[PDB]
């Protein structure tokens, strides 16, 4: 694209390190950086890298980082430490800072836990029109609610008859938290899709709502009883009630 | 080196004129640059100035170096919703001298809200069956005037209002949304902590 980051996301348990890697696939500019972003979403220059073999070292407000320039087209980042989550930006250009300028990358996000047992995917809810709404505006109003997850890590999504639909959607934009204060609060999230009230009265239609959970890894200290809350889809479905 | 953008948030009708102000305190001649940051992806350039005078475009957005008032001011004639996005105004050396870095400014919040040509508030009740101990109230296709409050009631849960276009029929609503885990819930106190419109419809449920 010009520019591939991995991993995309990760959890990790405070006071852990992760490695990034980025890689960068046209040498017209073949000037490696990273940035941080924090969680008030400022953007902080970490290191700029140009040629193979030289590392650098930072310590910032919430993590400690090793950077290095492995090849022409490989950077690698270390982060250590690590109290507060960030994403991690990659960018490369054809100079400097500012001699031309810089293309960021997709971005590692990193979601820092104090705890392991607070952890829960998100229970799904839908509910089907009101006959009310339908009555005054013929349009029909399902709602998505996602409720009890921690971490914040979900996308949602609606599925209409086996296709993904983005028009007539709105989802929050973050999600909101349960227990309002409480550093380890549960989040609840909402979604709304319209459609016009004959495409609802018409019982061929289905209706999902899908939530993707980012959550526990392949392995981790899972030394609870309860079910390991593992990435997941959790979903929930209506039928169109002709009624 | 500094990079100010005096305004944390900035709130917009479609088709309202838009100006973010970037002043940088540099004791250099400073190369200057817009960045847009869309929601779920990383900062998009926008375009870069390293003279006085010179002017800088792209997607309706315009800016001019100004080195007297030591300014970048970002602007744009008409925005409309998917101008809803993070703007960072930043700084460097185009020198090849060196760091590397880009100074970044705390960046601005852009929230373009549609204009409802016809407004009908209602506040209806939903259900469920297949779990929720619940029921929702959706509180919709209000004006962009008003603002949905966080609820005094720690038990309810209430969101901010948020806008869904139907494309294909050129429609777009405001919604936000209430429920709660108990009793004493009903959709006529459901938004009590919000100015609500004096003509907001509360239809009641199933039949006789």
């Known amino acids: 694209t010009l520019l591939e980051q991995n991993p995309r996301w990760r959890l990790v348990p405070r006071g852990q390190a992760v490695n990034l890697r980025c890689i960068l696939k046209?040498?017209?500019?073949?000037?490696m950086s990273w940035y941080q972003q924090d969680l008030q979403k400022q953007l902080q220059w970490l290191f700029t890298?140009?040629?193979?073999?030289?590392?650098?070292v930072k310590s910032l407000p919430g993590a400690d980082y090793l950077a290095t320039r492995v090849t022409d087209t490989e950077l690698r980042l270390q982060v250590a430490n690590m109290s507060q989550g960030r994403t991690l930006y990659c960018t490369c250009?054809?100079?400097?800072?500012?001699?031309?300028?810089?293309?960021f990358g997709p971005g590692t996000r990193l979601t820092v836990l104090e705890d392991l047992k607070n952890v829960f995917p998100p229970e799904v809810a839908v509910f089907e029109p009101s006959e009310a709404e339908i009555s005054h505006t013929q349009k029909a109003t399902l709602v998505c609610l996602a409720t009890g997850f921690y971490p914040d890590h979900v996308e949602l999504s609606w599925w209409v008859n086996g296709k993904e639909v983005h028009s007539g959607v709105c989802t929050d934009p973050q999600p909101l938290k349960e227990q309002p204060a409480l550093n380890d609060s549960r989040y609840a999230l909402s979604s709304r899709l319209r459609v016009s009230a004959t495409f609802w009265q018409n019982p061929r239609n289905h209706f999902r709502c899908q939530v993707q959970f980012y959550g526990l890894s392949e392995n981790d200290e899972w030394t609870q009883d309860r079910a390991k809350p593992v990435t997941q889809i959790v979903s929930a479905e209506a039928w169109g009630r002709a009624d | 080196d500094s990079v100010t953008q005096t305004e944390g948030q900035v709130a917009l009708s479609e088709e309202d004129f838009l100006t973010i102000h970037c002043n940088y305190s540099?004791?250099?001649?400073?190369?200057l640059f817009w960045y847009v940051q869309y929601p779920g992806e990383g900062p998009q350039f926008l375009f870069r100035?390293?003279?006085?005078?010179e002017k800088g475009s792209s997607r309706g957005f315009e800016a001019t170096y100004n080195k007297e008032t030591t300014s970048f001011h970002l602007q744009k004639a008409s925005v409309q919703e998917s101008d809803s996005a993070v703007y960072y105004c930043?700084?460097?050396?185009?020198?090849?001298?060196?760091?590397?870095?880009?100074?970044f400014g705390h960046g601005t919040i852009l929230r373009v809200h549609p204009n409802i040509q016809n407004p009908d508030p209602a506040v209806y009740q939903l259900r469920d069956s297949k779990s929720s101990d619940k029921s929702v109230c959706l509180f919709t296709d209000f004006d962009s005037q008003t603002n949905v409050s966080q609820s005094k009631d720690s038990d309810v849960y209430i969101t901010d209002k948020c806008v869904l276009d139907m494309r294909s029929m050129d429609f777009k609503s405001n919604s936000a949304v209430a429920w709660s885990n108990k009793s004493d819930f009903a959709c006529a106190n459901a938004f009590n902590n919000s100015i609500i419109p004096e003509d907001t419809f509360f239809p009641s449920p199933e039949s006789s």
């Open positions: 046209n040498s017209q500019y073949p000037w």
């Open positions: 100035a390293s003279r006085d005078k």
């Open positions: 890298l140009r040629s193979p073999g030289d590392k650098e």
């Open positions: 930043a700084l460097g050396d185009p020198t090849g001298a060196n760091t590397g870095k880009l100074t």
């Open positions: 250009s054809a100079g400097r800072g500012g001699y031309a300028e810089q293309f």
């Open positions: 540099a004791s250099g001649y400073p190369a």
